[PDB]
C-alpha cells in the first residue's frame, strides 16, 4: 500500500507540472491564444505550477519520511507558499466564472467594461489577497494556536503539522474557499437560468407550434458546467469542511483522512489544465508544442 501511495504522489507532481507548463507555453507562444479569458487562465496556471514545483514535493517527503527535515523557518515558508497558491488558484477560478458569465450573457457590455488593464488589476488583487491571507498571518505568527499540544509542534522543528487558532481557520477558509464557492455557484446558476429562460422565449415565439428539447449543444453545456463545479467541489470541499471541523471538536476526524483530503485538493491543480484549456486553438497549440 505505502509503496503504491508514494508512486501515486510522483505522477501528481508530473501531471501538474507537465499540464500547467504546457498551458503557459501555449499562451505565451501563440498570438491567437492571448485573449482576455486566457489572461486569467495564465494566473491560474502559474498558481497550479508553483503548487507542482515547490508545494507538493516538500509535502510528499513529509508523508514518506514521517517528519519535517528542513527546519522551522522553511516549514513556515512552505506553508505560506502552499496557502498562497491554493488561495490564488481558487479565487482565480471564481474570476473565470464571472468573466465567462459576462462574456456569454452580456457580451457587448463585457467588451467595453472588461479591458486588459482592468483584468491586470483583478489578477493583482487576487495575488495580493492570497499573500495577505497566507504570508502575513503565518510568518508573523497570527495563525498560532494557544493550546499546549499545538505549542509542542511549533517548537519541534521535525513537526510541521497544519494547526491553527479558531479565527484564522474560519477567516482563511471563507476568503480562500467558501466565498469563491458561493460566487461560482451563483454565477453559473445564472448561466443555467439565462439559458432556460431563452428556451422558454423560443417556445413562446412559435405560437404553440413547437416545444424545444435539449439538443446536443445543451447536454454538452450542462455536462461541462457539471465538471467545472463537480471537480472543484470534490477536490477541495472535503478538506475545507474538515479544516473548520478541526477548530471545534478536533478528535472527530482522524489525521490520516485530513491529510488525504489535502492531497485531493492538490490533484485539482492537475485537473484545471484539462478542464479550462479544451479550445480548438489550445489543441492546435499543444500539438505544435509537442513537435
Amino acid at each position, epitope marked *: 500500500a505505502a509503496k503504491v501511495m508514494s508512486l501515486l504522489m510522483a505522477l501528481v507532481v508530473l501531471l501538474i507540472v507537465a499540464g500547467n507548463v504546457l498551458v503557459i507555453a501555449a499562451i505565451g507562444s501563440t498570438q491567437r491564444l492571448q485573449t482576455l479569458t486566457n489572461l486569467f487562465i495564465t494566473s491560474l496556471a502559474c498558481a497550479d505550477l508553483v503548487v507542482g514545483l515547490l508545494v507538493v514535493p516538500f509535502g510528499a517527503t513529509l508523508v514518506v519520511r514521517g517528519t519535517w527535515l528542513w527546519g522551522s523557518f522553511l516549514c513556515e515558508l512552505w506553508t505560506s507558499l502552499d496557502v498562497l497558491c491554493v488561495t490564488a488558484s481558487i479565487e482565480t477560478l471564481c474570476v473565470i466564472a464571472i468573466d465567462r458569465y459576462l462574456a456569454i450573457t452580456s457580451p457587448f457590455r463585457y467588451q467595453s467594461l472588461m479591458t486588459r488593464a482592468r483584468a491586470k488589476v483583478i489578477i493583482c488583487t487576487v495575488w495580493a489577497i492570497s499573500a495577505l491571507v497566507s504570508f502575513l498571518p503565518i510568518m508573523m505568527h497570527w495563525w498560532r494556536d494557544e493550546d499546549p499540544q499545538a505549542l509542542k509542534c511549533y517548537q519541534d522543528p521535525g513537526c510541521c503539522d497544519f494547526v491553527t487558532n479558531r479565527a484564522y481557520a474560519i477567516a482563511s477558509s471563507i476568503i480562500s474557499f467558501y466565498i469563491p464557492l458561493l460566487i461560482m455557484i451563483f454565477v453559473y446558476l445564472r448561466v443555467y437560468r439565462e439559458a432556460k429562460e431563452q428556451i422558454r422565449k423560443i417556445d413562446r415565439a412559435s405560437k404553440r*407550434k413547437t416545444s424545444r428539447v435539449m439538443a446536443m449543444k*445543451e447536454h454538452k453545456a450542462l455536462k461541462t458546467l457539471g465538471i467545472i463545479m463537480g471537480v472543484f467541489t470534490l477536490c477541495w470541499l472535503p478538506f475545507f469542511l474538515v479544516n473548520i471541523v478541526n477548530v471545534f471538536n478536533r478528535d472527530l476526524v482522524p489525521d490520516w483522512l485530513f491529510v488525504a483530503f489535502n492531497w485531493l485538493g492538490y490533484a485539482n491543480s492537475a485537473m484545471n489544465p484539462i478542464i479550462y484549456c479544451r*479550445s480548438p486553438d489550445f489543441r492546435k497549440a499543444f500539438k505544435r508544442l509537442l513537435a
Partner: nanobody
Amino acid sequence: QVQLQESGGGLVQAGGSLRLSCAASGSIFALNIMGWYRQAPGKQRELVAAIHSGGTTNYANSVKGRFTISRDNAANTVYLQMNSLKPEDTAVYYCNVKDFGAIIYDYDYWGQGTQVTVSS
C-alpha cells in the same frame, strides 16, 4: 452539422435598400451571437452588426442609423435590413454565429459569403 445559408444580396442603386438573411440550421446553444461581417476588396474583414440571443445589439459606426439587425424569435435566422446604401458598402458579406455551448471558449461558424454591390 451546423450550416449557415445566406440570401438577399445582389446589385442595387445608391440610396436603395437590401435585406440580408442568414438561416442557421443544426444544433446551436441557446446563448449565442449571430452577426454580419463584411470584406471590401483589398481590405480586412470588419464587423457590420451583431445581435445576442438575449436581444442586445452592436453596430459599426459606418452603418449606424442606416442598417438594422434583428432575428427570428422562433428559429436561428438573422436579418440585416440595409437602407440608404452607398458605394462604400460594397463588399462580400459573411454571416457568423458565435456559439457559447462550451462555456470557457466560444465556437465560430462562418457562411460562404454573399456579394453586395452598390453602384452610383
